């Protein structure tokens, strides 16, 4: 009966008027683009009809792949579409995401991360497991999706049986059409109700203050029943905003209606992410409208439909990943959104009934200053993990490979340089066996190299734990109200040689205290990161076991225990090293960037040479997760990089 | 020589010097250096390093004495030797609050709060309590006192009063009045306690007599504020004393 009630709802989606037209294009054409606004039914209805196509084909049942850029999106829509097909999740409908695979030999529709299908492509280059592959929400132009577009453009020349469907929510289809050999376009019209677009008369000076004020005013003064969507840039900013919105409504007294604030970000567990599908609170007995406000990152910008939303609040910002290849820095920065994003944001209002979008900037600024399209992630990311995946795909010509928006050649030079000096490439540039193993790890190349090479330093059990703690959110919960108690608990685990060994101490103590939720609270340790780290470690070890990489430990009483770990770190991060200059600042190797130790380190002093996991570009340059290294290890472990003929004087 | 040259490193050098003497087989000389270290140290940070190293040394020799007495057969002096080292380790941990407090007193002898905490550790041991009051009165400069000096005097008199040694407490109060404290309010509060003591014991005529001497005018018509005058002289104006 639940299936039939889902069926009644799904038949009203805009795509269903185009099912026959969809099927007509899909059978006759190899590639095509499908454009439809968010909520038209794309992610839920289109792969089910591909299952209908793939079930009627004769022979062995190949699956349907549908990519999702976002882990949170991929899991939740897989659950939803299992409910739409009246099957159990992980049976005929499953999901596969980075560090978590919920699939089986029955899986004929798998919603997956881009960076897992691309990794499956590294092991199945023609993607023979799938008869239809669906590139969904491709207007986000994520780093692994852009690679998958080119891989499928190769495979379609070799596999006339594979169908490729590129799904978008933006009018930038012309780029997607021309790139897939002038393939057809299926445009699904909106059935979004009208969205009124409001602008401020002048530009607001504090967009966070403006965001909080606009959220409260809508809740008190708007007579339409409806949920709120506040867009913000990330976790820490949402958490302070959620505290502020709480205080500023609590001071308004009992007459204001109840507001249901729900965070939605990627580091939340699945059970807490699933809470967004709960109904809004009811209207109070005094007539005050009960509303839900979802205060989300850009994970809610695509793939998701929150029913009942009427009022959208758009500050216009998000966090984007940026890479600066001239200085080899990767960072997350807050950037302005595109007009395309701002239209998609506004079109969330019109989903359940007519609605309003309150843009906190002038209408003049909207016309002339906002960018038309969002920049592709490949134009702003380190290609080192991608080039490692690309070389594993048999893509040798990285210069003339058909990227839809090609990266800067210098950025490609940095990806080749990084892999050459790591001995993942030789001096001719071919992919070594070491690189081929590194690509299979769902890690950055520095992290992948460090896990593999640590086997020879007899400390691969510890480095795998460090890498897992680095592949997950930072493990020290440091609440603003509780900093003193959190630091004093953190200093119980602080290792003198730095953060990597401090993460090791936290992880060992976590495993020694039998994964205790209470112990995590009492020591301000992120239980969810640690369970994710344990999940990360148990799967990377299964990759290590697959490549026979020996899990080794050094004697804990030996002086060389921590020293060997510190040497093993150098094997992957020798490019991410800084020297302590005589004036007490650090200078990064080759790129000569002036940096400081990040204020979350345990290092209270400055070693002459420090290795760092992450460069943190802010109002000052910081290096984060730092460890003391000795300079006589650099010339012995990496002579090609530390050749003093070409190395700058530092 | 290094200990004179490297003035900041001392606790580490003592432990390295003790280590040399451990390897020399002069285990007693290691203990000599660690107590010498504890005596010289003037930070809790250095003290922690010395304490932890000495305890590990004590632990290792206690375990060694247990094993050797079982292997060699227990001579009476050998079994007593083990009991001594344990009791020295019992002394070490019990001395540790007193030593910790003493280190802060090495940093500031004027630290009246640490004097109260020292007496608080001495509790149940009257002679130690009596002596540390006397040491507090001698060491603390009123003009540098962190924590007001009369609070020592009140507790000093109260302890004798709790012991019923009222005439000794009076002598303490008499000595207290001789002190020229940093502020008139310190001496005034003492004069109150002189009165209040007699009120508890209902010696009301003596209370009056004390306050008559307290209020008693200088031959000058002295100001309440003139710091060149003795603190005893200034008390004659005091609001508290007259109101009482």
């Amino acid at each position: 009966p639940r299936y039939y009630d889902i069926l009644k709802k799904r038949l009203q989606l805009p795509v269903w008027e185009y099912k026959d037209r969809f099927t007509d294009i899909l059978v006759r054409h190899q590639s095509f683009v499908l454009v439809g606004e968010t909520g038209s039914g794309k992610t839920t209805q289109i792969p089910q009809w591909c299952v209908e196509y793939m079930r009627s084909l004769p022979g062995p049942k190949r699956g349907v792949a549908c990519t999702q850029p976002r882990r949170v999106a991929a899991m939740s829509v897989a659950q939803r579409v299992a409910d739409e097909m009246d099957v159990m999740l992980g049976q005929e409908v499953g999901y596969s995401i980075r560090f978590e695979d919920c699939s089986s030999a029955k899986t004929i529709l798998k919603y997956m991360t881009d960076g897992m299908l691309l990794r499956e492509a590294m092991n199945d280059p023609l993607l023979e497991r799938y008869g239809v592959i669906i590139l969904d929400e491709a207007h986000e132009r994520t780093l692994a999706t852009d690679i998958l577009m080119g891989v499928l453009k190769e495979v379609v020349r070799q596999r006339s049986d594979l169908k490729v469907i590129v799904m978008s929510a933006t009018l930038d289809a012309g780029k997607f059409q021309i790139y897939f050999d002038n393939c057809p376009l299926l445009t699904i019209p909106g059935r979004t109700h009208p969205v009124e677009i409001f602008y401020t008369p002048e530009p607001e000076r504090d967009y966070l203050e403006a965001a909080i004020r606009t959220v409260i005013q809508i809740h008190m003064c708007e007579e339409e029943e409806g949920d709120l969507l506040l867009f913000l840039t990330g976790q820490e900013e949402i958490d302070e905003a959620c505290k502020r919105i709480k205080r500023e409504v609590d001071d308004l007294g009992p007459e204001v209606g109840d507001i249901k604030i729900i965070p939605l970000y990627s580091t939340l567990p699945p059970q807490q992410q699933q809470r967004i599908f709960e109904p809004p609170p009811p209207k109070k007995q005094n007539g005050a409208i009960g509303r839900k406000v979802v205060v989300s990152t850009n994970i809610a910008e695509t793939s998701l439909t929150i029913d009942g939303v009427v009022f959208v609040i758009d500050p216009g910002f998000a966090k984007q990943k940026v890479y600066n290849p001239r200085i080899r820095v990767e960072s997350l920065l807050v950037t302005a959104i595109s007009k395309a994003s701002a239209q998609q944001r506004a079109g969330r209002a019109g989903r359940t009934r007519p609605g309003k979008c309150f843009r906190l900037y002038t209408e003049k600024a909207y016309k002339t200053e906002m960018q038309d399209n969002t920049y592709p992630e490949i134009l702003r990311s380190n290609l080192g993990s991608v080039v490692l995946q690309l070389k594993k795909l048999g893509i040798d010509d990285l210069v003339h490979f058909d990227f839809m928006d090609p990266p800067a050649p210098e950025t490609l030079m940095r990806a080749l340089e990084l892999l050459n000096y790591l001995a993942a490439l030789n001096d001719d540039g071919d992919l070594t066996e070491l690189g081929s193993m590194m690509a299979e790890f769902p890690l950055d190349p520095q992290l992948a190299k460090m896990v593999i090479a640590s086997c020879d330093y007899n400390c691969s059990n510890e480095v795998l734990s460090i890498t897992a703690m680095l592949s997950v959110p930072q493990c020290f919960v440091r609440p603003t109200e509780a900093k003193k108690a959190a630091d004093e608990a953190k200093m119980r685990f602080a290792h003198i040689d730095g953060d990597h060994l401090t993460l090791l101490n936290v992880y060992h103590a976590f495993k020694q205290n039998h994964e205790s939720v209470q112990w995590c609270y009492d020591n301000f340790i992120n239980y969810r990161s640690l369970m994710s780290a344990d999940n990360v470690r148990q799967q990377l070890s299964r990759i290590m076991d697959r490549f026979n990489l020996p899990r080794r430990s050094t004697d804990f009483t030996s002086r060389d225990y921590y020293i060997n770990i510190r040497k093993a770190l150098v094997t992957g991060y020798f490019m991410q090293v800084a020297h302590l200059e005589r004036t007490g600042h650090y200078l990064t190797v080759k790129d000569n960037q002036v940096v400081q130790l990040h204020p979350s380190t345990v290092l209270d002093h400055k070693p002459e040479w420090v290795l760092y996991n992450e460069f943190v570009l802010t109002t000052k340059n910081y290096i984060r997760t730092c460890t003391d290294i000795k300079p006589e290890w650099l010339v012995k472990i990496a002579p090609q990089y530390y050749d003093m003929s070409n190395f700058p004087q530092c | 020589g290094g200990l004179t040259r490297f003035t900041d490193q001392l606790g580490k050098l003592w432990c390295s010097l003790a280590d040399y003497y451990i390897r020399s087989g002069h285990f007693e000389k290691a203990r000599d250096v660690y107590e010498e270290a504890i005596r010289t140290v003037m930070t809790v940070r250095d003290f922690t390093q010395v304490f932890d190293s000495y305890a590990q040394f004590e632990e290792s020799m206690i375990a060694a004495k247990m094993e050797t007495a079982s292997e060699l057969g227990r001579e009476e002096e050998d079994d007593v030797d083990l009991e001594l080292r344990l009791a020295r380790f019992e002394q070490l941990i019990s001395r540790r609050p007193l030593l910790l407090n003493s280190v802060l007193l090495r940093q500031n002898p004027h630290h009246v709060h640490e004097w109260h905490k020292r007496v608080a550790l001495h509790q149940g041991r009257p002679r130690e309590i009596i002596n540390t009051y006397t040491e507090a009165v001698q060491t603390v400069d009123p003009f540098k006192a962190t924590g007001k000096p009369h609070t020592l005097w009140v507790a000093f008199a109260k302890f004798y009063e709790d012991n019923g040694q009222l005439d000794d407490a009076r002598v303490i109060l008499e000595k207290a009045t001789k002190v020229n404290f940093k502020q008139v309010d310190d001496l005034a509060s003492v004069w109150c306690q002189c009165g209040e003591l007699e009120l508890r014991h209902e010696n009301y005529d003596e209370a009056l007599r004390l306050l008559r001497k307290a209020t008693a005018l200088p031959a000058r018509r002295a100001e309440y504020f003139d710091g060149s005058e003795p603190v005893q002289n200034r008390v004659y104006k005091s609001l508290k004393v007259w109101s009482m």
Binding site: - | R23, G25, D52
Partner: peptide
């Protein structure tokens, strides 16, 4: 830390010192 560096170094060194010390004594 400068202070803690000597703490970790000497903790391992004291155990070596106790081991060689019992042999010498």
């Amino acid at each position: 830390p400068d202070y803690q560096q000597q703490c970790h170094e000497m903790a391992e060194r004291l155990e070596d010192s106790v081991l060689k010390g019992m042999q010498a004594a």
